[PDB]
């Protein structure tokens, strides 16, 4: 299945994923498209930030679901 | 060291801090990776509310010590 990732600069990327894919893997598949390191990426879904350990099936994310990209500023 | 900050919804947040970090620092890290401003943050450890201006060693926060976060809205 594929899900949408929308960013604050208007870029809409549709990334082919799987319910078993972890959030660390979907972030790793975004840097291959834009170059943003996974540590900066903050994925937002239904007003909740996806944790770096769980899979996107723990959040019941379905096909054609939209994710919002937020970038950290300092890290750590 | 890695500490955890859980909320009331059930989300756990893993932070990699140091025993000498101040509480204004750990609130800044929560804002940086979760977006909530520090004014809406209230850290609880063993029922005691964390007072801004003290290091994590003042509250004897070992590694993997789970903190609790409640919003101020």
């Amino acid at each position: 299945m594929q899900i949408f990732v929308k960013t604050l600069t208007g870029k809409t990327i549709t990334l082919e994923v799987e319910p078993s894919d972890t959030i660390e893997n979907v972030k790793a598949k975004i840097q291959d498209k834009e170059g943003i390191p996974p540590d900066q990426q903050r994925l937002i879904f239904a007003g909740k930030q996806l944790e770096d350990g769980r899979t996107l099936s723990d959040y019941n994310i379905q096909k054609e679901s939209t994710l919002h990209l937020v970038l950290r500023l300092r890290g750590g | 060291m890695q500490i955890f900050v859980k909320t009331l919804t059930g989300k756990t947040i893993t932070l990699e801090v140091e025993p000498s970090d101040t509480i204004e620092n750990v609130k800044a890290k929560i804002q940086d990776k979760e977006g909530i401003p520090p004014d809406q943050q209230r850290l609880i450890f063993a029922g005691k509310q964390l007072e801004d201006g003290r290091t994590l060693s003042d509250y004897n926060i070992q590694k993997e010590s789970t903190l609790h976060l409640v919003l101020r809205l």
Partner: antibody
Amino acid sequence: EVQLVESGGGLVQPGGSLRLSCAASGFNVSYSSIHWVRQAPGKGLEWVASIYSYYGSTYYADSVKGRFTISADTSKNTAYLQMNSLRAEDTAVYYCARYGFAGQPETWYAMDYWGQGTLVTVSS
Amino acid sequence: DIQMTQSPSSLSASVGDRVTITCRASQSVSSAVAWYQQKPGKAPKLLIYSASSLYSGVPSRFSGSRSGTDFTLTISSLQPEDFATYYCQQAYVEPITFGQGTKVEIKR
């Protein structure tokens, strides 16, 4: 594969204007932070301005507030620094640096890559 | 704001000596401190970021450390190509401030 190329520096009379450009390659300015640091002759490094192009946040130092305008064009992947009302104390080597993730996870961000530096000289 | 204070201002140690550079922070900065090296006539290069993390491409003889508001840059095998000026940086609050600098020369 990532580098920052600067331009715009040179000689200018006090009170004149200069626009420094910072061409970026290997990354997207619209997703990274770009700062400016100057070094006066015989002095150390002083922070000038900064941009967080993802949100549009710009910050300045009290010594250049109201005179310098920092901007970023995403189309050509370039960050600009419009310097106005230049004084003699502005003569320095201005650097363009990217601020962000530096390699190890769960670590604070730092300025990893810098430009070669351009020289702005201000005198009559 | 938050200003760094480096010590000492200048050093001189022979090849192989272990030299430390002290950087004292104004307020609490956490680990948001980076070390930079500026060789004469070149741009500042990043050495140690996030208080103690080593950057890719920097020799392993450079290291950083944190203890409260104090940060130390240490070089184990001081080589002739280490003559430069070293600046600690504060990347916590946005008015970014550097250290005064530390010129290190080789004792010959």
